[PDB]
Amino acid sequence: MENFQKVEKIGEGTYGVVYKARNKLTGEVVALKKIRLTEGVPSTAIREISLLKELNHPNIVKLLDVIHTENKLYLVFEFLHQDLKKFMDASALTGIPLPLIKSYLFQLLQGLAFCHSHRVLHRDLKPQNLLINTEGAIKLADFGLARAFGVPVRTYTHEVVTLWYRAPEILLGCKYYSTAVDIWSLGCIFAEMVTRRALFPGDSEIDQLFRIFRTLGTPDEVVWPGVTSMPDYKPSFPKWARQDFSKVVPPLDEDGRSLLSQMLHYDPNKRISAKAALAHPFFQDVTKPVPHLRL
Ligand SMILES: CCC(C)(C)[C@H]1CCc2n[nH]c(C(=O)NC)c2C1
Numbered sequence: 432m433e434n435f436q437k438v439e440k441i442g443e444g445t446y447g448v449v450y451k452a453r454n455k456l457t458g459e460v461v462a463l464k465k466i467r468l469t470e471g472v473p474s475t476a477i478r479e480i481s482l483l484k485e486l487n488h489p490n491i492v493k494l495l496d497v498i499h500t501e502n503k504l505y506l507v508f509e510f511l512h513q514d515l516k517k518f519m520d521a522s523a524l525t526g527i528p529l530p531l532i533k534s535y536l537f538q539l540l541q542g543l544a545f546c547h548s549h550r551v552l553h554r555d556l557k558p559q560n561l562l563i564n565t566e567g568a569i570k571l572a573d574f575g576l577a578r579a580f581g582v583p584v585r586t587y588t589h590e591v592v593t594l595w596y597r598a599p600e601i602l603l604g605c606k607y608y609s610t611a612v613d614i615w616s617l618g619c620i621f622a623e624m625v626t627r628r629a630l631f632p633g634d635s636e637i638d639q640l641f642r643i644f645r646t647l648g649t650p651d652e653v654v655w656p657g658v659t660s661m662p663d664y665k666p667s668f669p670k671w672a673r674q675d676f677s678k679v680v681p682p683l684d685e686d687g688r689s690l691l692s693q694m695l696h697y698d699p700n701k702r703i704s705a706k707a708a709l710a711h712p713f714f715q716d717v718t719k720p721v722p723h724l725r726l
Pocket residue numbers: 441442444445449461462464492508509510511512513514559560562572573
């Protein structure tokens with residue numbers, strides 16, 4: 432772009448670099464993602480992304496514009512001041528207060544209920560693409576399209592993609608993702624906010640898969656019909672017994688643990704939907720606290 436002045440690099444996104452930029456004309460502060468395209472223009476991929484501009488909801492970071500020019504694809508996002516990853520790190524000694532964790536989870540599920548009702552999947556939810564503001568809101572950002580740009584083994588910067596929040600069906604090679612993959616990721620995020628430690632910190636696809644198995648038990652046809660016929664399932668997978676759930680997220684009350692267990696069901700069909708999750712008793716006393724943010 433030429434109508435933008437970089438303020439600082441927000442990071443090396445999954446497709447390109449992201450800068451905090453000022454719209455030299457409007458004075459608007461935005462998050463600008465630059466995706467390098469090499470020759471064959473991704474018309475399909477480009478149209479999918481563009482439709483995301485109509486996806487407007489209080490818990491979704493607004494995609495202001497999508498500019499394809501000079502073999503580059505620019506995504507202009509509304510700017511929020513901090514991501515959940517940084518907030519979680521900054522809250523590591525004291526932990527995020529439960530009422531705030533609950534508020535964040537509730538809002539994220541409202542956001543997912545919204546995109547899912549519009550047939551939009553995120554596919555790569557993680558603390559890094561969950562953005563928060565001073566008023567207590569948290570918003571989903573950077574919806575992916577495995578249906579197009581697939582899933583680059585490594586972001587444009589040769590950087591390692593995090594597998595910690597990946598649903599088991601994706602790891603087992605399912606060709607078709609369902610909205611259930613986002614519920615799984617959010618469940619993992621919820622656990623992390625609660626314990627202050629990643630639930631399944633795998634450093635490889637198989638390690639990711641096995642860490643899940645070690646905690647939730649190796650899945651079989653009883654809990655997950657069809658699992659043994661999945662593309663990457665191997666009858667040789669070690670058979671781990673399911674761990675007592677009270678050991679998984681200790682500080683969490685029973686309502687929180689029951690909701691989490693439902694978000695982490697192996698069978699995508701048994702996994703709770705965002706809509707049903709919003710009705711869970713865990714949210715009976717949900718409120719909207721203000722986070723203490725250091726910007
Ligand atoms: C790949 C796009 C990512 C990096 C997730 C951006 C999505 C949109 C966005 N808006 N603000 C921020 C921000 O980080 N602020 C401090 C972001 C992050």
